[PDB]
C-alpha cells in the first residue's frame, strides 16, 4: 500500500552499478603534496560573527555578512571596503554575489531573501526587492541571472524567484528536513541543495522536480558545492565528513574524513581544476583535501573561532575564508 | 608612494567605512540582548513593551532588545547558536495549561512539553553560563482550574493540597530542578500579571543581578 517494494528497487539498481571505487582508479595519480597555504590579506571591520561570504565573477570582489547587521563588499587585492550595506535584520545566515556583480542577496533568520542593487545611479545601495515567500529561516540564496534567484529556507523547500515580478517562479518541496545550503551548476540549468535530513536532492530549474536524491551522510548536511565540471558535487555535514556525489553515476564516489576530526563541516568549495576541496570545520580551521584521493593536502589555521564560510575565486587565484571571529582572510 | 590617485581615494573610503562600522558596533554593544522562549508570550510582550520578532523597550536608562523566535518551527538546533552570548533567556509558561494535551492523540501534555523545552534550553551547550528569567503566566486561570481539576492529573506522584500557593511552589520547584548546572547559572522565577508594570521591574532586576554576578566572577569574587 505505502510503496513498500519501490524503496528496495532503487537501492538494488544503484548497488548493481557499483564496479570500481574512485580510490582504486586514482592509485596511479601522483600525490599533490603539502601546499604552503599562507594568508596574504587579512580583512577586518566586522565586529560580530560572520556567517557567509561569496566571491564575485571578477575574482577580486567578494561580499560578507555578519550578525552585527552589516553587509560588506571587499576589494580583495587592496582590502578596500567597497560598500557597507546595513542589514535591516541583523540575523543574516547567507549572502551571494550576482554573476554580473550588479546585485547581491542576503538571507537571515527572517524568511526574506533581500536583493540589493550595487549599480544604482543613486549610488547608495538599496534593497531592490524583498522576497517574503518563505515560512522559515533562509539558509542559502543564490543568483542564476540578474532577474532569477533561487533560495533555500528552513521550511524544507527551496524556491525559484522571478525578481522583477517578486513571486516564486517554482517551488521545490521534495525535502522533508530543513534545507541548509544551495549550489548552482556551472550551466545554471540545475542545482543541488543539502538538508538536515542527511540527504541531498538534484533540482532542475526549468522544470522544478527532484531528478535524484543522495543519502550518503549520516547527519545534517550544512554545505554543498558543485564540482567545476558540473557533473559532480561535494557535501558537508555535521557527520564530520565530506562526500563526493556524481550526478550521472548516481552513487557516492569518495569521502573526506580523518579520525583527528570529530566536528561538523561548515562549508565546502573546489578549485578550478577540482583537485582541491576547501572545507571549513568547527575546530577553527579549514582542511584542504585531495579531491581525487581524499588526502588532506593542507590546513588553513589562523582563525580564533569556527570557520563559517569559504570560497575560491573564479580565476582560481586565492581562496577566502570566514570565521565567527569576524575576520576574513585571503589565502593564496 | 606606490598607490595611484584613485587608490588613495579608495583607501579613504575604506577607512571611512571602518569608522562607520566601529561606531555602529560600539552603539550596538551598549544594549542588552534578551532571548525569549516558551504560554502567555504575547500577553507578556504586550505588558512589558513570519520569522524572528524583535522588540525594543527601555527601562530606567537600560536598553533591551528582545528577540522572540516568532514560532520558528524549523530546526532550533541549527540557529539557536545565533543567540550565543545573550544576557538572559526569558521563558514563559502558562500554569493553567497543566490539563491541555496539545492534541497529537494525547501523546503529550503542554506542561510536559514546556518542561522538556526548558530543560533543553537550560542544558544547551551555547547557554552554559546564561541566566534564565522564568515567568509563570495565567495564574488566575490556574487557580480557577485547580479548584475544579486537581493538578495531580499532570503530576501523578504529587501528593499535596490543591491550593494555589502550594501548587505554584511545587511547579516552580519542578521547573527549577531541571537546571543541571545550578552553580553556573541562576533561574529567576516570577509569577506575573499582578500588575502590568511588575514584569519589566523583575526583568530589570534579573538583568542587573546577572551583570553584577558576571562582573564579580570576572574578578574572582563570585
Amino acid at each position, epitope marked *: 500500500q505505502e510503496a513498500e517494494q519501490l524503496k528496495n528497487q532503487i537501492r538494488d539498481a544503484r548497488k548493481a552499478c557499483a564496479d570500481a571505487t574512485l580510490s582504486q582508479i586514482t592509485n596511479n595519480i601522483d600525490p599533490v603534496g603539502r601546499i604552503q597555504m599562507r594568508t596574504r590579506r587579512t580583512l577586518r571591520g566586522h565586529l560580530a560573527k560572520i556567517y557567509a561570504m561569496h566571491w564575485g565573477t*571578477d575574482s*577580486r*570582489l567578494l561580499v560578507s555578512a555578519s550578525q552585527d547587521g552589516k553587509l560588506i563588499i571587499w*576589494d580583495s*587585492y*587592496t582590502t*578596500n571596503k*567597497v*560598500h557597507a550595506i546595513p542589514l535591516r535584520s541583523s540575523w543574516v545566515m547567507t549572502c551571494a554575489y550576482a554573476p554580473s*556583480g550588479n546585485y547581491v542577496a542576503c538571507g537571515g533568520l527572517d524568511n526574506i531573501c533581500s536583493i540589493y542593487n550595487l*549599480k544604482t*545611479r*543613486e*549610488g*547608495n545601495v538599496r534593497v531592490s526587492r524583498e522576497l517574503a515567500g518563505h515560512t522559515g529561516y533562509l539558509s542559502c540564496c543564490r543568483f542564476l541571472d540578474d532577474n532569477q534567484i533561487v533560495t533555500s529556507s528552513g521550511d524544507t523547500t527551496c524556491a525559484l524567484w522571478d525578481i522583477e515580478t517578486g513571486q516564486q517562479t517554482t517551488t521545490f518541496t521534495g525535502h522533508t528536513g530543513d534545507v541548509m545550503s544551495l549550489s548552482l551548476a556551472p550551466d545554471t540549468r540545475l542545482f543541488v541543495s543539502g538538508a538536515c535530513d542527511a540527504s541531498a536532492k538534484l533540482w532542475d530549474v526549468r522544470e522544478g522536480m527532484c531528478r535524484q536524491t543522495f543519502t550518503g551522510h549520516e547527519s545534517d548536511i550544512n554545505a554543498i558545492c558543485f564540482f567545476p565540471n558540473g557533473n559532480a558535487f561535494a557535501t558537508g555535514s555535521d557527520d564530520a565528513t565530506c562526500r563526493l556525489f556524481d550526478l550521472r553515476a548516481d552513487q557516492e564516489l569518495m569521502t573526506y574524513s580523518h579520525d583527528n576530526i570529530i566536528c561538523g563541516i561548515t562549508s565546502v568549495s573546489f578549485s578550478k581544476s577540482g583537485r582541491l576541496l576547501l572545507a571549513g570545520y568547527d575546530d577553527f580551521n579549514c582542511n584542504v583535501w585531495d579531491a581525487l584521493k581524499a588526502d588532506r593536502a593542507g590546513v588553513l589555521a589562523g582563525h580564533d573561532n569556527r570557520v563559517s564560510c569559504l570560497g575560491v575565486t573564479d580565476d582560481g587565484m586565492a581562496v577566502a575564508t570566514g570565521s565567527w571571529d569576524s575576520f576574513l582572510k585571503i589565502w593564496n | 608612494c*606606490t598607490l*595611484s*590617485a*584613485e*587608490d*588613495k*581615494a*579608495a583607501v*579613504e*573610503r575604506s*577607512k*571611512m567605512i571602518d569608522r562607520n562600522l566601529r561606531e555602529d558596533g560600539e552603539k550596538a554593544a551598549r544594549e542588552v540582548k534578551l532571548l525569549l522562549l516558551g504560554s502567555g508570550k504575547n500577553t507578556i510582550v504586550k505588558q512589558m513593551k513570519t520569522g524572528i520578532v524583535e522588540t525594543h523597550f527601555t527601562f530606567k536608562d537600560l536598553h533591551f532588545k528582545m528577540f522572540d523566535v516568532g514560532a520558528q518551527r524549523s530546526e532550533r538546533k541549527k540557529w539557536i547558536h545565533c543567540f550565543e552570548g545573550v544576557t538572559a533567556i526569558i521563558f514563559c509558561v502558562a500554569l493553567s495549561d497543566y490539563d491541555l494535551v496539545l492534541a497529537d492523540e494525547a501523546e503529550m501534555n503542554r506542561m510536559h512539553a514546556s518542561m522538556k523545552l526548558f530543560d533543553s534550553i537550560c542544558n544547551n551547550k551555547w547557554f552554559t553560563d546564561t541566566s534564565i528569567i522564568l515567568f509563570l503566566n495565567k495564574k488566575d486561570l490556574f487557580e480557577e482550574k485547580i479548584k475544579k481539576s486537581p493538578l495531580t492529573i499532570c503530576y501523578p506522584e504529587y501528593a499535596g493540597s490543591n491550593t494555589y500557593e502550594e501548587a505554584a511552589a511545587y511547579i516552580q520547584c519542578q521547573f527549577e530542578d531541571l537546571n543541571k548546572r545550578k552553580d553556573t547559572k541562576e533561574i529567576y522565577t516570577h509569577f506575573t500579571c499582578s500588575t502590568d508594570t511588575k514584569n519589566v521591574q523583575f526583568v530589570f532586576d534579573a538583568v542587573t543581578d546577572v551583570i553584577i554576578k558576571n562582573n564579580l566572577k570576572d574578578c574572582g569574587l563570585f
Partner: single-chain antibody
Amino acid sequence: VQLVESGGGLVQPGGSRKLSCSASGFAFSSFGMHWVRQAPEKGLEWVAYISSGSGTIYYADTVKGRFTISRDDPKNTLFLQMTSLRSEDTAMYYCVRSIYYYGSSPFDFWGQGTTLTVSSADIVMTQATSSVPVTPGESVSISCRSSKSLLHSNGNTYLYWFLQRPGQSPQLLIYRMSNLASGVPDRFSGSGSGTAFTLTISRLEAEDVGVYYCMQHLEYPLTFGAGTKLEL
C-alpha cells in the same frame, strides 16, 4: 541623480566670489566631487578635488591657495570660494561626482555648470586633431598622446574620454581606456598602447557632434587636451 551649480556672475578685477553646487537623487556624502573650469572658446581644466568625508583635498598648481573647496554633507551641497580672482579666471565651472572603488566609473555624471567672468612634472595630454570634418554613418577615430605612460603598476590604464555636445555638459564615454560608461551607446570603443590611445566610433550619429576631451588620472594634477571638435 542631479547636480545644480550656482553663484555665477561678473567679478571686478581682484574680486572674490563663491560658487555652489547642490546634490540630489544620490548619496552626496559617498561621492567625491571635482570642480572643472572651462574658459570660453577653450578646453576644460580640473580645479580642485575634495574626497568623501573631506579627508583628502587636492588643488591644481594654478588655483591652489586662492581657491578653496568645502562640502556640506548634511545639506548635500558643494562650495568653491574664490579670492583675488584674476582676469585669466574667466571661465565656466562644472561640478563632477566621483566615487572610487574597484569597478566604479569615476566622472560618470556632470553638473549643469555655471558661468563666471572676471574683469612641474604634470602629465600633458595632447590631441592630434582639434577639428575633424566627418559625415554621419562613417566611423570616426580620435587619437591622443600622453607625455607619461598611463599604465600603472597595478595593471590599470587611467585614461578618460569625455564628450561635450553644443550647449551641454560633458558626458563620460570611457573611464579606464577599456570600459564603456553607462548611459552611452555601444558604438563607442576604446583601445590604445601604454602611452598612445584612440577613441574609435563604429558609426557616427547626429548626436555625436561635439568636442571630445581626454584626461589622465594616473596622478591628480589632471590636464585636459585641446579637444577634437567634430563637425558635419
